Design a protein around this ligand. Structure first.
Ligand SMILES: [Mg+2]
Ligand SMILES: [Mg+2]
Ligand SMILES: [Mg+2]
Ligand SMILES: [Mg+2]
Length: 150
RNA sequence: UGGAGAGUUUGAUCCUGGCUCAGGGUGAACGCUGGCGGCGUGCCUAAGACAUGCAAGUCGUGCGGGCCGCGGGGUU
């Protein structure tokens, strides 16, 4: 068990003679607040069920966010298709400035002091997906020179 | 020591893309309302037209006299 906050939920739909069937979507984040988080997307015939599946995959796929002072190691940019995200580390006592998507994800990941910018396609879903791969690719002075051994 | 976005093309999706909004600002004006003070600020329009008053003068230690009001006899 971790935190588990719910990003957004939508009602989609398809066609079929007679009318339109349906489906709901659940994009969800999860994190103790120690440097561990997981994003999960859940589709299901009903609101609650979907929100459930959310957390399930959420916990399934999670990442080691190497914090530091409560901020972040280095500044990075990542593009996920059409949606691009900028993560830039702030000094203690700043705030977590971001949209609902990147902020939510960033809170449970721990961070308290981070500068963020949401460029490109601002597709909620895709921003999330983007935010993760960002963290995923975070390095510390350690694992840095850990590769420049030889 | 510094960086948040959202609504809106579709049965739904993703993308592109414009329109729209929340902010801050002003020698402001307009509506409704209106108690006190301090500090600022107040014809952005017709460089249109203007009554009245004032905004530029001063030195008798540069010089000669006019009027007014002071004191003082050279030829008897
Ligand atoms: Mg691209
Ligand atoms: Mg069309
Ligand atoms: Mg419609
Ligand atoms: Mg003028």
């Amino acid at each position: 068990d971790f935190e588990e906050k719910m990003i957004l939920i939508r009602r989609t739909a398809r066609m079929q003679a007679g009318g339109r069937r349906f489906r709901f979507g659940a994009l969800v984040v999860v994190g103790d607040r120690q440097g561990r988080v997981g994003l999960g997307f859940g589709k299901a015939p009903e609101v609650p069920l979907a929100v459930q599946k959310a957390g399930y995959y959420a916990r399934r796929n999670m990442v080691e966010v190497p914090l530091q002072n409560g901020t972040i190691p280095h500044e990075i940019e990542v593009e996920f298709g059409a949606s691009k995200i900028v993560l830039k580390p702030a000094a203690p006592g700043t705030g977590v400035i971001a949209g609902a998507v990147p902020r939510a994800i960033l809170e449970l990941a721990g961070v308290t002091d981070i500068l963020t910018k949401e460029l490109g396609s601002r597709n909620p879903i895709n921003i999330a997906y983007a935010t993760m791969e960002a963290l995923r690719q975070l390095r510390t002075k350690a694992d840095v020179e850990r590769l420049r051994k030889g």
